[PDB]
Structure formats: structure tokens, C-alpha cells
Amino acid sequence: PRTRRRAYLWCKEFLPGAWRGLREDEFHISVIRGGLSNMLFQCSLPDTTATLGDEPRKVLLRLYGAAMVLESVMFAILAERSLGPKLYGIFPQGRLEQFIPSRRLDTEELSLPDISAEIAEKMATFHGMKMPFNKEPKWLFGTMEKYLKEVLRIKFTEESRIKKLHKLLSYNLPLELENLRSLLESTPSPVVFCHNDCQEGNILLLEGRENSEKQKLMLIDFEYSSYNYRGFDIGNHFCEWMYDYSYEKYPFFRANIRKYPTKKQQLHFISSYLPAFQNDFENLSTEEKSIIKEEMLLEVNRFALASHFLWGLWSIVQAKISSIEFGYMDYAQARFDAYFHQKRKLGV
């Protein structure tokens, strides 16, 4: 399109070497993810054109479509620190990032011992770093209260969605949030820099590193990241073991309660997290380690309720406003079913 030109100009003007002197009739762009927001494209030199210096042959273009300062600063910082794709270009419409040869993980891979251990280690790393953002943990209850406010105001026109929403509203979401509030306020959890969306779709498996045991993954997509309770980040990740967003028919996901990590799988994950986060931890006694882990299991199982609640509310608002083809109302109902299931399991 016209879009094609613009993208050519971005690459020509922002990228070094071969790119600088490149013609419009040599530009290779393809869609990776279309839509109206956060569109993703692959852009590349002709296979035929040689590279002057260090310039990449392929880049990823992200377009904002339809807090900008914050996300940009964070992405740049993560690039500088080698915990994210390099930033090659930034502009009002979007950015040019490094193209990492890789694929996203699938849902079932989250439970593989070595994958899970590395995710825990990466999360521990992310959690231990300093970022120029507000350190007060207002994000969790702030976001829930914001989405709850939207939810309570939403009017659907179509009858199907009116009834689905009516069933969700019948839980008494305001009162249930206060129930969650008293539970979580009685559960100490350290405030750390949280990814807040640590799912398979945000975890790259690096090409050529598949044989590495401990270093084959990169966490990406920090758009929800904030200082938050560590319980949320781990609990949210555990919840993600149940949800597979690759299903190709309506509602475009599958939920499987049975796939929530067992006590053993949770212990495996936190056994890998804790030494990467707490430098002393390795040197503690067996009983002290055991005490910490048992406490941490209670912590993250309770914060998993907020994952269900927050993303359930979020998903209701998305049904009203999103352009993505996804069964948002059914996903909201699946999160709320898991919320009540997890409360029954915990006895809270």
C-alpha cells in the first residue's frame, strides 16, 4: 500500500549501511500480525544485497496503530541491557526492533522441566532489576478498579452478550473484589519489577539454542510491566498453563483446569526462581529453604486469584472495544470459573 512506502522510508532513514542506499523496488516487507493496534511486520534486504558493516538483514517493524514515553524508555533500557531485542529506530508511529530468529512457545511447553526452570530464572532476573518507574504497588488493585468501573458501565446491544454479562455481574464483582482485597492484603509479597503477562505467546525460543538447557528463551512484550507484587507475576504465569490461545475455531482458546501446575511442578519452578532472585538463598539450611518455599506456594496460589479476576474484567472490556477476533466473553467466563475453582481449592 501507501503503508509500504512509509515503512520503506523508516527502514531507509533509520537503518545503517546497505539500507541507507536502498530503492523502493527492493524493499521486502511482510505482515506477521495484522489488525488495528500493535501490528508487526518483517522487513528485509534482498537476499542479493551484501551488508556494508554490522547492519541487520532483517528487522521487525511494530506500528502502534491506535504511557508511550514509558513503554519506549523501558524497551530501550531492556535493549541496552541485552534482556530484549535491540532498538534500531523509534518514531511517532512505532519502532524498528531486532528480528530474533525464534518461535513462540506453545502452552504445553510451559510444563517441560527445563523450560519452566529457565522461565523462573528469567523472571527472577527481571524481578531483580531497577527501572525508573513508580515503586508503589498500585498497579494491581488500580487496574482491577479501573476495569471494574468500565465493566459496570458497559452496555451490549446484542442479546447473547447481554446475557453473558448479566451472569458475570451476578457474582457481585464489587463485593468479590473486596473479598480478594482482604485476602491479598493479608498475604505479604515483595514488590518487584513485574512482567505481568508472562505467557507462552511472550516467550521466544531462540533458533540454534534449542540444545541449550538453561539459555534458550527470551521474555518479550513488556507492555503491561510495572512494579507489582511478585505473587502476581508467578501466579499469573501458573494460570497461563491452563490457557491455549492457538485454537483455530471460536472462541479461539482452550481452557484446561487440569493443566494448572501440580505442587511438584510449582516447587520445581520456585526452586529455580529463588536462587536466581535471592543471592543468599542457596546457603540457607534445608528447613529454612523448605519454610520459604511452603510460604511462597501460599503466596503465589493466592495471587493467582488476582490473575483470573484482573484478566476476567479486562476481557469483558475487550469484548466491547477490541477489533481482534477472539471469544472475549467466553474467556472472561473461563477466568471467573477458575477464580471460583481456585478459591474452593484454597478454602478461602
Is residue 98 marked as binding? yes
Residues after which the chain has a gap (C–N > 2.5 Å): 66
Q: Measured from the CB of residue 179, what is the shortest distance to Mg ion in angstroms?
A: 30
Q: Measured from the CB of residue 202, what is the shortest distance to Mg ion in angstroms?
A: 5
Residues that bind Mg ion (CB under 5 A): 202, 221
Is residue 62 marked as binding? yes
Is residue 37 marked as binding? yes
Q: Measured from the CB of residue 248, what is the shortest distance to ligand U6H in angstroms?
A: 11
Q: At what angle do helices 113-127 and 230-239 cross, to 10 degrees?
A: 150
Q: Measured from the CB of residue 13, what is the shortest distance to ligand U6H in angstroms?
A: 20
Q: State the burial class of residue 50 (Cβ atoms within 10 Å of its Cβ: 0-12, 13-18, 19+).
A: exposed
Within a 10 A sphere around the Cβ of 139, how many other Cβ atoms?
A: 21
Q: Measured from the CB of residue 296, what is the shortest distance to ligand U6H in angstroms?
A: 29
Site for ligand U6H in 32-51 (CB under 6 A): 32-33, 40
Pairwise CA distance, residues 239 & 199, whole Å = 9
Least Cα distance to 129 among 189, 80, 70 occurs for 80
Quickly tell me which residue has 467466563 as its cell.
333
Nearer to ligand U6H, 197 or 299 (CB): 197
Nearer to ligand U6H, 40 or 77 (CB): 40
Is residue 153 marked as binding? no
Backbone dihedral region for residue 130 (phi beyond 0: left; psi -120 to 50: alpha; all else: beta)? beta
Residue 225, contacted partner among Mg ion, ligand U6H, none, CB below 5-8 A by kind:
none
Site for ligand U6H in 58-77 (CB under 6 A): 60
220 binding ligand U6H? (CB under 6 A) = yes
Residue 58, contacted partner among Mg ion, ligand U6H, none, CB below 5-8 A by kind:
none
Query: In sequence order, what are the residues at sequence separation of 6 or more whose Cβ sits closer than 8 angstroms to the Cβ of residue 299?
Result: 187, 188, 189, 230, 231
Evaluate whether 328 touches 322 at the Cβ level (below 8 Å).
yes
Least Cα distance to 115 among 209, 195, 224, 223 occurs for 209
Is residue 302 marked as binding? no
Q: Measured from the CB of residue 316, what is the shortest distance to ligand U6H in angstroms?
A: 23
Pairwise CA distance, residues 167 & 190, whole Å = 35
Residue 104, contacted partner among Mg ion, ligand U6H, none, CB below 5-8 A by kind:
ligand U6H
Site for ligand U6H in 76-115 (CB under 6 A): 85, 97-100, 102-104
Amino acid at 30: S
Is residue 101 marked as binding? yes
Q: Point out which residues bind ligand U6H (CB under 6 A).
A: 32-33, 40, 60, 85, 97-100, 102-104, 204, 220-221
Residues forming the annotated binding site? 33-39, 62, 98-104, 199, 221
Residues forming the annotated binding site for phosphocholine? 35-37
Residues forming the annotated binding site for ATP? 33-39, 62, 98-104, 199, 221
